A paper describes a structure:
Urease is a nickel (Ni) enzyme that is essential for the colonization of Helicobacter pylori in the human stomach. Ni delivery requires urease to form an activation complex with the urease accessory proteins UreFD and UreG. Here, we determined the cryo–electron microscopy structures of H. pylori UreFD/urease and Klebsiella pneumoniae UreD/urease complexes at 2.3- and 2.7-angstrom resolutions, respectively. Combining structural, mutagenesis, and biochemical studies, we show that the formation of the activation complex opens a 100-angstrom-long tunnel, where the Ni ion is delivered through UreFD to the active site of urease.
Here, we introduced R179A/Y183D substitutions to HpUreF so that we could obtain discrete particles of HpUreFD/urease complexes for cryo-EM analyses. Additional substitution of E140A to HpUreD was found to stabilize the complex, and protein samples of H. pylori urease (HpUreAB) in complex with HpUreF(R179A/Y183D) and HpUreD(E140A) were finally used for data collection. Four copies of the urease trimers form a dodecameric quaternary structure with 12 protruding HpUreFD molecules. As expected, the R179A/Y183D substitutions disrupted the dimerization of HpUreFD, and each catalytic unit of H. pylori urease is interacting with one copy of HpUreD and HpUreF. Binding of UreD induces major conformational changes in three switch regions of HpUreB: (i) the glycine-rich loop (277GAGGGHAP284) between strand 6 and helix 6, (ii) helix H3 and the loop connecting to helix 7 (residues 330 to 340), and (iii) residues between strand 12 and strand 13 (residues 538 to 545). Upon binding of HpUreFD, residues 335ADSR338 at the C terminus of helix H3 uncoil, causing switches II and III residues to stretch in opposite directions and residues Arg338 and Arg340 to flip out toward UreD. The stretching motion of helix H3 brings Val332 of HpUreB to dock into a hydrophobic pocket of HpUreD formed by Met36, Phe39, Met49, and Leu51. We noticed that the formation of the HpUreFD/urease complex opens a tunnel that reaches the active site of urease. Tunnel searching was performed using the program CAVER 3.0 (22). This 100-Å-long tunnel starts at the active site residue Lys219 of urease, exits HpUreB near Asp336 of the switch II region, passes through HpUreD between the two layers of β sheets, enters HpUreF near Ala233, and reaches the dimerization interface of HpUreF. The UreD/urease interaction causes Phe112 to flip to an exposed position and thereby open a passage that connects the tunnel between HpUreB and HpUreD.
Author numbering:
A (entry chain P): 30 to 45, 49 to 254
B (entry chain N): 229 to 342
C (entry chain M): 1 to 238
D (entry chain R): 1 to 114
E (entry chain O): 1 to 260
F (entry chain E): 160 to 238
Write the structure that this text describes.
């Protein structure tokens, strides 16, 4: 059903390489063990994921419910012009393009006239905004869509951390299981956030993302 | 040191001592100035501070017994134009050239409409 | 109409400004005196009118004279025109800075400087000290203040700085903002090296024997960063 | 030691050796032939300047202590066009050269003691 | 609740003078703002110091700055000293700065670091407008507080919005929000134990990313990085324990830009 | 508690404390300029909160009973 299609498109897009600065943290020896990785993940989810991805997802969901294509495009432009790190900007653009292409090609079903028009008129679609507008057009619940997106992104983050630190699958499962309460807290925060906090400037995360370009050997795209 | 010596000599010779305190807090704050005064009769100019670094804490000395506080013309009464002329007056009085970056940076005021 | 000497002086200034204005209308390029008088008289009249504030008058004084209305060199000579004007809320000092744009043709008293830097405190080696302002107010230290005896709210290794002063242009100052940490360069105090005054921590010749007394005094008086031994041996005079 | 730009130095203290100044609006250019000052020890009066108790004003002055000192003056005279401090004592020119405090500065003669 | 008698405004408009120097064509300032004559160093750009006659921004302060640099003006705009945000009890201190740079004009906006005190609430809104040929070197340093006295992230809230438009088209957006109540700014993603944060934007400057990266790497005591924004303009973000390394890095980058 | 104060009794009268005896007395602020000179030379200056610390330190050094001064006492330039 809807959950099956969400899982299918998520698997076809995201698993089918992006570190978002985690590689830089590991190379600079700031993330070493389970507790350090958990602290990094909590901080990243609290600042950058919350104020750049979840907030943008909620804003795009509201704008698509109101059928505000101009508002969606303005939000995308704000995100693009606020994303200072080149690696982060390129990763977001690539993920959004991949999501749009997968929806256009693999999903042989009536996604929606609004979504089709948005895809045909957009220029730099972020992955979070694309998922938000897709959920809004499909009628998915806002809280459920946010929970699913956050869970998928955190699963990718924990598997990347377990591959790169490296950790054990036991530690990966532990950090996946121990983040349930922060997930609910982040969803509750997004439930009361607003557009004024969109793309709140993270400092150390952006610095590490930009230093990822100057890293000696890059095992991750961004 | 100068405050202490002047107050000693003035107590010897029965003459008043007036003070215009250190604006830069170079040697100490209002507490250090009051400790140097050491509860001896002192007549203070610009007890409101007049934008000095002792401001606004130097107003505290106006409650001490040994301090006779005086206030200057320009800041009374408080009007709409009072704050506009203060920096020019301060720079010209303290002999800081307005064409010098160092002197302009030095000319720092802690004056407030409050 | 009891007239004060200040009022008589202002009347003379106003009519000098009127003469300058009449000459400007005739088309004579104003000289230094005429330009200053014109600006001052205009500011006084506007303040008497009372529709403008001192800030508005400071802005407006810079628009009275164009560079082509004055003789060559007048704009260079006039740096600022101050005038005490009686507003509806009392007498205020209106200062107009650079009221006329310089043409650049003739600069009276202009300097022709060499293109070579001045080396100050030549032959004196400077040491570097890290200073933190742990107080709540900014602190300015002059070029010749004995750095050992600065505000006790500044935190640094005072032992390193005994007998030294800031290595900056004389008459300039270094500002330490609260909480801010800066690195400063210090050079030995010259001459007889007799430190008198300041915070009365030395009050004598600055040498290694007076250094211990100064450090003990600073520790007793609570100067930050002053480290003196717990078992301090007093001298006959200290 | 430190080097500051000549423009900033001249703005702070006036022209020094080798610097030229136009006299009035005329075409005459006067060059400073020599300077008595020691760079970095110039006498300045102001808020946090050098002419202060214990820095350039001696706390143990010579018995020939000046009544008035003119600091950083460009002397233009038939004896030469140079830069110095002029000390005046008892209505006469007491000394011409580097004035200040012998306790904290070098090259200060007894007749130029501030 | 403005404590000043009138609204705090600073309208400045600079143009090229008759003698070829950068002069102040027009200026109107109410307290605590003040403008002096521009300073002209021997070799650098014309320097203008935005004087603030006050110990710092307090509750109810609402400053409105409007700078207008005309064509062919090489201006560096600095401040008198560190901008301190005092304890705003129930209100806040707000600054709204609108800058307009003309054609072929270079503006180096290099204010001193901002030091928020305990329970400080500040709202800054900077809007810079440029032409195609305009060059801008914007900078902003934020301190965690009075670090030397263990006043770390004790302020109420720091909101700073920067909007840079080129040819009336948005090219840079920044929204720095620091709220210690909502989250710990000492975490590994916000400050990671650093106390001073420098954000610098180079628009249309003739400096290479390799040169900026070399400057950042050779700068000591600073964890910094430089990237290219969407509009192909340089953005530098640096962290340091003190403001001295950040100021040295900023002046190094400014010198590298100006020496071209 | 008693710095800057005197007994609240008729002027010219006295209060007697016998050895070992404990009494309760009433104290009122010293009037006038509140400049304390003489006595045991513990104040010898204007009586205010800043001179209170110096007086307490002096009394503790000279062994006055009940005078409590902090162990880490910061000296002033004149005291």
């Amino acid at each position: 059903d809807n959950e099956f299609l969400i899982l299918q498109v998520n698997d076809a897009v995201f698993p089918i390489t992006h570190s978002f600065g985690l590689e830089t943290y590991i190379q600079q020896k700031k993330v070493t063990n389970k507790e350090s990785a958990l602290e990094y993940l909590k901080a990243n989810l609290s600042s950058q994921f919350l104020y750049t991805e979840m907030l943008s997802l909620k804003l795009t969901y509201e704008s698509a419910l109101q059928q505000d294509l101009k508002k969606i495009l303005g939000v995308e432009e704000v995100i693009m012009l606020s994303t200072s790190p080149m690696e982060l900007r390129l990763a977001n653009q690539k993920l959004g393009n991949r999501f749009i292409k997968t929806l256009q090609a693999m999903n042989e079903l009536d996604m929606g006239e609004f979504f089709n028009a948005y895809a045909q008129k957009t220029k730099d679609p972020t992955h979070a905004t694309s998922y938000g507008v897709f959920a809004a057009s499909l009628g998915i619940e806002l809280k459920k869509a946010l929970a699913h997106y956050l869970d998928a992104q955190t699963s990718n983050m924990v598997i990347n951390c377990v591959k790169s630190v490296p950790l054990s699958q036991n530690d990966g499962q532990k950090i996946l299981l121990s983040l349930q309460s922060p997930f609910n807290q982040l969803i509750e925060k997004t439930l009361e956030l607003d557009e004024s906090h969109l793309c709140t400037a993270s400092v150390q995360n952006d610095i590490k993302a930009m230093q990822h370009e100057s890293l000696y050997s890059r095992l991750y795209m961004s | 040191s100068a405050i202490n010596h002047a107050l000693d000599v003035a107590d010897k010779y029965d003459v008043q001592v007036a003070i215009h305190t250190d604006t830069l807090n170079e040697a100490g704050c209002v507490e250090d100035t009051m400790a140097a005064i050491a509860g001896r009769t002192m007549h203070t100019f610009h007890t409101e501070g007049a934008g000095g670094g002792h401001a606004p804490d130097i107003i505290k000395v106006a409650g001490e017994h040994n301090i006779l506080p005086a206030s200057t013309n320009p800041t009374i009464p408080f009007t709409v134009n009072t704050e506009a002329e203060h920096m020019d007056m301060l720079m010209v009085c303290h002999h800081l050239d307005k064409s010098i970056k160092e002197d302009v940076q030095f000319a720092d005021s802690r004056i407030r409409p409050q | 109409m009891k007239l004060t000497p200040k009022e008589l002086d202002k009347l003379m200034l106003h009519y000098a400004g009127e003469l300058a204005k009449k000459r400007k209308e005739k088309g004579i390029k104003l000289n230094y005196v005429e330009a200053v008088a014109l600006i001052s008289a205009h500011i006084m009249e506007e303040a008497r009118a009372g529709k403008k504030t001192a800030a508005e008058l400071m802005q407006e004084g810079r628009t009275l004279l164009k560079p082509d209305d004055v003789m060559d060199g007048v704009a260079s000579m006039i740096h600022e025109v101050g005038i005490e004007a009686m507003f509806p809320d009392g007498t205020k000092l209106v200062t107009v800075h650079t009221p006329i744009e310089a043409n650049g043709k003739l600069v009276p008293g202009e300097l022709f400087l060499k293109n070579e830097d001045i080396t100050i405190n030549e032959g004196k080696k400077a040491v570097s000290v890290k200073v933190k302002n742990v107080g709540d107010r900014p602190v300015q230290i002059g070029s010749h203040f004995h750095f050992f005896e600065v505000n006790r709210c500044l935190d640094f290794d005072r032992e390193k700085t005994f007998g030294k002063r800031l290595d900056i242009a004389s008459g300039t100052a270094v500002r330490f903002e609260p909480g801010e940490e800066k690195s400063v360069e210090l050079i030995d105090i010259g001459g007889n090296r007799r430190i008198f005054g300041f915070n009365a921590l030395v009050d004598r010749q600055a040498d290694n024997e007076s250094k211990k007394i100064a450090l003990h005094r600073a520790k007793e008086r609570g100067f930050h960063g002053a480290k003196s031994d717990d078992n301090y041996v007093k001298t006959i005079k200290e | 030691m430190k080097k500051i730009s000549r423009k900033e130095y001249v703005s702070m203290y006036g022209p020094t050796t080798g610097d030229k100044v136009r006299l009035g609006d005329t075409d005459l250019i006067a060059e400073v032939e020599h300077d008595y000052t020691i760079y970095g020890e110039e006498l300045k009066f102001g808020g946090g300047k050098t002419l202060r108790e214990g820095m350039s004003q001696s706390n143990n002055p010579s018995k020939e202590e000046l009544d008035l000192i003119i600091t950083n003056a460009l002397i233009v005279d038939y004896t030469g066009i140079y830069k110095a401090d002029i000390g005046i004592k008892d209505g006469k020119i007491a000394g011409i050269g580097k004035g200040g405090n012998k306790d904290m500065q070098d090259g200060v003669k007894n007749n130029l003691s501030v | 609740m403005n404590t000043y008698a009138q609204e705090s405004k600073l309208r400045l408009k600079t143009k090229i003078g008759a003698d070829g120097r950068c002069v102040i064509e027009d200026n109107f300032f109410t307290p605590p703002f003040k403008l002096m004559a521009p300073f002209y160093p021997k070799d650098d750009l014309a320097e203008i110091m935005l004087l603030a006659v006050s110990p710092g921004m307090m509750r109810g302060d609402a400053q409105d700055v409007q700078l207008n640099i005309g064509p062919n003006c090489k201006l560096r705009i600095t401040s008198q000293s560190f901008e301190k945000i005092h304890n705003t009890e129930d209100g806040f201190a707000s600054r709204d700065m609108h800058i307009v740079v003309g054609e072929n004009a270079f503006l180096d906006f290099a204010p001193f670091p901002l030091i928020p005190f305990e329970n400080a609430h500040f709202k800054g809104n900077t809007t810079i407008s440029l032409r195609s040929s305009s060059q801008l070197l914007y900078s902003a340093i934020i301190v965690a507080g009075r670090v030397a006295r263990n006043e770390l992230f004790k302020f109420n809230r720091l909101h700073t919005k920067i909007s840079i438009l080129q040819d009336e088209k948005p090219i840079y957006y920044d929204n720095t929000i620091l709220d210690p109540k909502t989250t710990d700014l000492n975490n590994m993603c916000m400050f990671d134990g650093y106390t001073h944060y420098l954000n610098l934007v180079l628009v249309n400057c003739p400096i290479e990313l390799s040169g900026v990266r070399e400057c950042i790497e050779e700068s000591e005591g600073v964890d910094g990085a430089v990237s290219e924004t969407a509009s192909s303009h340089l953005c530098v973000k640096a962290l340091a324990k003190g403001s001295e390394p950040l100021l040295h890095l900023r002046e190094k980058i400014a010198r590298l830009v100006t020496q071209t």
